Structure formats: C-alpha cells, structure tokens
Structure 1
Amino acid sequence: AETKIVVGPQPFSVGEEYPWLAERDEDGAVVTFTGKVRVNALTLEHYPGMTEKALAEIVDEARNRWPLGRVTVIHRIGELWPGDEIVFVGVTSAHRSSAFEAGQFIMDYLKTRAPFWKREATPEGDRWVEARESDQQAAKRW
C-alpha cells in the first residue's frame, strides 16, 4: 500500500493527515503518534538525502514484520518552539495489534536510526540534546 514520507520545516496538521490514512475501508485500525516539543528555540539539524532514505527503510522493515496498509511519517526540521509538533507517524492495518506495534516500532527506530540532531537555546548559549540508552533498548527489543 502507499507510503507518505515528508521531511521539511512546514507545520503539519493531524486533521489534514488523518483522512488520507483512514480512506481505505479494508484497514479497520488506524494508529497515530504525535511527538511535540515540551521561549527557547530548538533547531533540528538533519542529513539531507539520508534522512528521507532512512525513514523509507524503517517503514520498509515495518512492512516486512506486519501487514500494513497506508503509512505516513512526517518529521520537521529547522527552528521549532515549545509546543510545536515535531513528528507524526500514522499506520493502518486490518487489526489493532499490528497498527499499535508497527507505530511504536517506527518511532523506536526513527529515534535511533534517522539522522536528526536537536540543539536547544537556553539563556547562556546553545546546548545539544543528549541521546538516551533507553531508546537503544526500545529499538533492539523488536
């Protein structure tokens, strides 16, 4: 089935993205995940080309493990603010367990394999966000 991958600075709207995902009657289950930034600007650096390739490869692997219908993955770049939605993953399947599992798998892999880096603003200078070993554990369990 079709896959939509978008990497860009522009905001997205779940209300705009959901209808396409939910279009097919054969997909009884639709799961979405939205990740947001929780005054100090965050910037999201990325590796042009590899980022899109990586995201496509993650969805490819998810399709090998689960029988998925439509999938959408959107990740923003450039400067973002507290409260901004940064990432969207939508997955459909005939049944709910595949949609929930694949949705979480895609995020776990995105967090460990997609070339993105966050830098925060803070009063006295910029600070690169630290990665977490817990995300390595979340990814390797699958």
Structure 2
Amino acid sequence: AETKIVVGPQPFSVGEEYPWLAERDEDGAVVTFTGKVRVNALTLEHYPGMTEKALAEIVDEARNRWPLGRVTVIHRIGELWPGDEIVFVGVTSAHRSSAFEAGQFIMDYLKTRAPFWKREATPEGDRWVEARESDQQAAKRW
C-alpha cells in the first residue's frame, strides 16, 4: 500500500510511472488519468508547504473509501503550454469499479482542494483562469 506524491516543474512520462504502479500482482486493475493544459502559456502558482500534503490527505481519504493498492499522484507547477501534461493520477485495486471511482474521486478533490492557481499569458496581460461550478458539483457528489 505505498503512495508516491510529487509536485514540481519536471515533466513526467507515463511510461516511466506506469510499471511501478502496475507491478503488484494482487492489484489486478490499473486506472490512470492524465490531464493536460487546454495559443497561450499557462503558469500554475501554488502553495508549496501544502500541495504534497493535501494530495496525500486526498489519497488517505480515497484509501478509507476503497481498497487500493499502489497509488501515484504527480502535479506540475511553472509555465506550461497547451498539450503539456500537467497532472498524473494512477490508482490500482483488485476490481475496476474501485479503481475508476478512486481515480475520479482523486481528480474531483484535487481540482477543488489542492492549492494551485492557473494564470494565462494573453495578448492583453496575465489573466486568472476561472474556477468552474461543475468541479464543485463533481466534488460534492462524493
């Protein structure tokens, strides 16, 4: 039941993260999610003392709700561009139903609880990306 949580500018590669995630036999169901930047550069400002820690509290909760094997969560910071991978979530379990659900849960809580703020470098200047009502409705259904 180990957990990997990393917050940093470094790109990740799903091919490097994956074999560690999928390695235990008893974890027969592996779900990954990757989220990319949606032409303008984005900067993710964050709260450093809290990002790894909130991500760890979210997995702790997921682990009380579902029986999970290895879990990985990677979130980047800094300047990124559309098509760059920003977040990786990897979850394992004995059955597909808990792996998909924990995956979904981890993202919905990440998007409303983890201290990151996107800003967009437009022709008119930086612009804070707006927070969505649909992410709040996604989080509250859990």
Fold shared, TM-score > 0.5 on shorter chain: yes
What is the Cα deviation at residue 49 of structure 1?
A: 1.2
Deviations 1:102-136 (A, max 9, x none): 00000000000000000001111111000011101
What's the counterpart of residue 139 of structure 1? Answer: 139
Let me know the Cα RMSD of the aligned residues. Answer: 0.6
What is the Cα deviation at residue 31 of structure 1?
A: 0.1
Query: Which runs of structure 2 are paired with 1:1-142 in the superposition (5 Å)?
Result: 1-142=1-142
Percent identity over paired residues? 100
What is the Cα deviation at residue 139 of structure 1?
A: 0.6
| Unpaired segments ≥5 residues, structure 2 | none
Secondary structure at the aligned position of 2:125 is classed as coil
What is the Cα deviation at residue 82 of structure 1?
A: 1.2
| Unpaired segments ≥5 residues, structure 1 | none
What is the Cα deviation at residue 39 of structure 1?
A: 4.1
What is the Cα deviation at residue 81 of structure 1?
A: 1.0
Secondary structure at the aligned position of 2:16 is classed as helix
Q: TM-score, normalised by structure 1?
A: 0.98
Structure 2 CA distance for aligned equivalents of residues 106 and 88 of structure 1:
11
Structure 2 CA distance for aligned equivalents of residues 38 and 140 of structure 1:
24
Structure 1 CA distance for aligned equivalents of residues 86 and 111 of structure 2:
12
Structure 2 CA distance for aligned equivalents of residues 43 and 93 of structure 1:
34
What is the Cα deviation at residue 10 of structure 1?
A: 0.4
Deviations 1:27-49 (A, max 9, x none): 11000000001242100000011
Structure 1 CA distance for aligned equivalents of residues 70 and 99 of structure 2:
10
